[PDB]
Amino acid sequence: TGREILEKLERREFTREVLKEALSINDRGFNEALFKLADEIRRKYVGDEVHIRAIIEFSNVCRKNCLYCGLRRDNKNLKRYRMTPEEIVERARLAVQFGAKTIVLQSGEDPYXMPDVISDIVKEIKKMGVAVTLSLGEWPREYYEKWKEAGADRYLLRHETANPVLHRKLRPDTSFENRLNCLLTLKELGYETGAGSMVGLPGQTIDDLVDDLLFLKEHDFDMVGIGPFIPHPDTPLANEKKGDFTLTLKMVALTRILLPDSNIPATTAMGTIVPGGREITLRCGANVIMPNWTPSPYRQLYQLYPGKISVFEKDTASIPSVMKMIELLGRKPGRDWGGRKRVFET
Ligand SMILES: C[C@H](CCC(=O)NCCC[N+](C)(C)CCCS(=O)(=O)[O-])[C@H]1CC[C@H]2[C@@H]3[C@H](O)C[C@@H]4C[C@H](O)CC[C@]4(C)[C@H]3C[C@H](O)[C@]12C
Ligand SMILES: C[C@H](CCC(=O)NCCC[N+](C)(C)CCCS(=O)(=O)[O-])[C@H]1CC[C@H]2[C@@H]3[C@H](O)C[C@@H]4C[C@H](O)CC[C@]4(C)[C@H]3C[C@H](O)[C@]12C
Numbered sequence: 001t002g003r004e005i006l007e008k009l010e011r012r013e014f015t016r017e018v019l020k021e022a023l024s025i026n027d028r029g030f031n032e033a034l035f036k037l038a039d040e041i042r043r044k045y046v047g048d049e050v051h052i053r054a055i056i057e058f059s060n061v062c063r064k065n066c067l068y069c070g071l072r073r074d075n076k077n078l079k080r081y082r083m084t085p086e087e088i089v090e091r092a093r094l095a096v097q098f099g100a101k102t103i104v105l106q107s108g109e110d111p112y113x114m115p116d117v118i119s120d121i122v123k124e125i126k127k128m129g130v131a132v133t134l135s136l137g138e139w140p141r142e143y144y145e146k147w148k149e150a151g152a153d154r155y156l157l158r159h160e161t162a163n164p165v166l167h168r169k170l171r172p173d174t175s176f177e178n179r180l181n182c183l184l185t186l187k188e189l190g191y192e193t194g195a196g197s198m199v200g201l202p203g204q205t206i207d208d209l210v211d212d213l214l215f216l217k218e219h220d221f222d223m224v225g226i227g228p229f230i231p232h233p234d235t236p237l238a239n240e241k242k243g244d245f246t247l248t249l250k251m252v253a254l255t256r257i258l259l260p261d262s263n264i265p266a267t268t269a270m271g272t273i274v275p276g277g278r279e280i281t282l283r284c285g286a287n288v289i290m291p292n293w294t295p296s297p298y299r300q301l302y303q304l305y306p307g308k309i310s311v312f313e314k315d316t317a318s319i320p321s322v323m324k325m326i327e328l329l330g331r332k333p334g335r336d337w338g339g340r341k342r343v344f345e346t
C-alpha cells in the first residue's frame with residue numbers, strides 16, 4: 001500500500017523493493033504525497049533559494065552518434081555552428097551582468113576547442129568572479145585536469161542509463177563503463193560532479209529506473225539532471241514513445257529523497273513536454289534552473305530534441321523570465337554560487 005511505502009521512504013528504508021513499488025504505484029493520492037515529501041525534504045535541506053545556471057550551448061558539432069540525440073554525427077539535416085571564443089566570453093559577461101552566478105558551457109563533443117581553447121575561455125570567465133560548469137562529454141583525463149587547473153568548478157556528465165547493455169546500444173561509440181570512469185575521474189580531480197538519466201528511453205524498464213536511483217545514491221553526486229526522452233525526427237528513435245512526465249517527476253522526487261542535500265535542476269526537457277513543467281518540478285524536489293543563454297542565431301540550431309522552449313524570445317529574456325518564475329513560486333534567487341552544502345548524517 002502506498003501508505004506503507006511512504007512510511008519507509010520517510011524512514012529512509014531505501015531498498016530496491018521500496019523504490020520499485022514507489023515507481024509502480026500510480027495512485028494519485030500516493031503520487032501527491034510522494035511529491036509533498038520531496039518538496040518538504042528540499043525545503044528542509046536546501047531551502048527556498050533556486051540557483052540560476054546560465055547555459056551557453058556554444059557548438060552543436062559532435063563526433064558521437066548517440067541514437068536519441070538530434071546532434072548525432074549522422075544527422076546531415078542540421079546546420080552546424082561554432083561560437084568563437086570571444087563570442088563565448090562576451091556572452092558569459094552579459095549573463096554575469098544580468099546576475100548569473102554560474103555559467104554553464106555546453107556543447108556536442110566538438111574536437112576543435114579541446115582542450116586548450118576551452119581552458120582559455122574558462123580562465124577569462126573565472127575573472128568575472130562566478131562559478132564555471134562544463135558539460136562537454138567524454139574526454140581524456142588530461143583534458144579534465146587542464147580544465148580544472150584553468151578554474152572550472154563543476155562538470156555535468158549525465159550517466160544516461162545505468163543498464164550497460166542499453167547504454168551500449170544507445171551510445172555505440174562508448175560504454176557505461178567509460179561514462180562511469182569519466183565521472184569517477186572528475187570527482188577525483190575535485191570537480192563538483194553531476195550525473196543523471198533520461199526517463200522513457202526505448203527498452204528501458206521500471207527496474208532500470210530503480211537501478212538509476214541506486215546508482216545515484218551509491219555515488220552521492222553533487223548534481224542530478226533528469227528529464228524525459230523526447231524523440232527527434234532525424235534520429236533512429238524517431239518513432240519511439242516520449243517519456244512520461246509524471247514518471248519522470250517521480251524520479252526527480254525520489255532523487256531528492258535519496259540525496260537530500262544535492263542540487264537538482266528543473267530541466268528544459270521537463271518544460272518542453274508539459275507546459276509549466278519546470279515550475280511543477282521545482283515544487284517536487286528541484287532547486288536549480290538553467291535559463292538558456294545561447295544567442296541567436298545559434299540558439300535555434302541546438303536541436304537535441306524538437307519543441308525546445310525558449311527559442312522564440314529575445315535572447316536576453318530567459319534570465320528575467322526565471323527570476324519572475326522564482327518570485328511567483330514564492331522562492332528566492334540564489335545569493336552565492338550555489339555550490340553543494342553537504343549536511344553530514346549518520
Ligand atoms: C493548486 C492545485 C489545486 C488547488 C485547488 O484548487 N484545490 C481546491 C481549492 C483549494 N483551496 C485551498 C485553494 C481553496 C479551498 C476552498 S474550496 O471551497 O475552494 O474548496 C493543487 C492541487 C494539487 C496540488 C499539487 C499536489 O499536492 C502535488 C504537489 C505537492 C507539492 O508540495 C507542491 C507541488 C504539487 C504539484 C501541488 C501543487 C498545487 O498545490 C496543486 C496542483
Ligand atoms: C546589464 C545592464 C546594465 C548595467 C550593468 O552592466 N549592470 C551590471 C550589474 C552586475 N550585477 C548583476 C552583478 C549587479 C548586482 C547588484 S545587486 O545590488 O543586485 O546585488 C542592467 C541594467 C538594468 C539591469 C536589470 C534591472 O536591474 C532589472 C533586473 C534586476 C535583477 O536583479 C537582475 C535582472 C534585471 C533584469 C537586471 C539585469 C541587468 O543587470 C540590467 C539589464
Ligand SMILES: C[S@@+](CC[C@H](N)C(=O)[O-])C[C@H]1O[C@@H](n2cnc3c(N)ncnc32)[C@H](O)[C@@H]1O
Binds near residue numbers: 137197227
Ligand atoms: C546533448 S548533450 C551535450 C553534452 C555532452 N555532449 C554529453 O552528451 O554529455 C546533453 C544531454 O542531452 C540529453 N538529450 C539528448 N538527446 C535527448 C533527447 N532526444 N531527449 C531528451 N534529452 C536528450 C542527454 O541526456 C545528454 O546528456
Ligand SMILES: C[C@@]1(C(=O)O)N[C@H](C(=O)O)CS1
Binds near residue numbers: 055226268
Ligand atoms: C542542461 C541539462 C541538464 O540537465 O543538465 N538539461 C538539458 C535539457 O533538459 O534540455 C539537457 S542537459
Ligand code: SF4
Binds near residue numbers: 062108
Ligand atoms: S548526447 Fe552529447 S555526445 Fe551524444 S550525440 Fe548528443 S551531443 Fe553528441
Ligand SMILES: [Cl-]
Binds near residue numbers: 053102104
Ligand atoms: Cl551548475
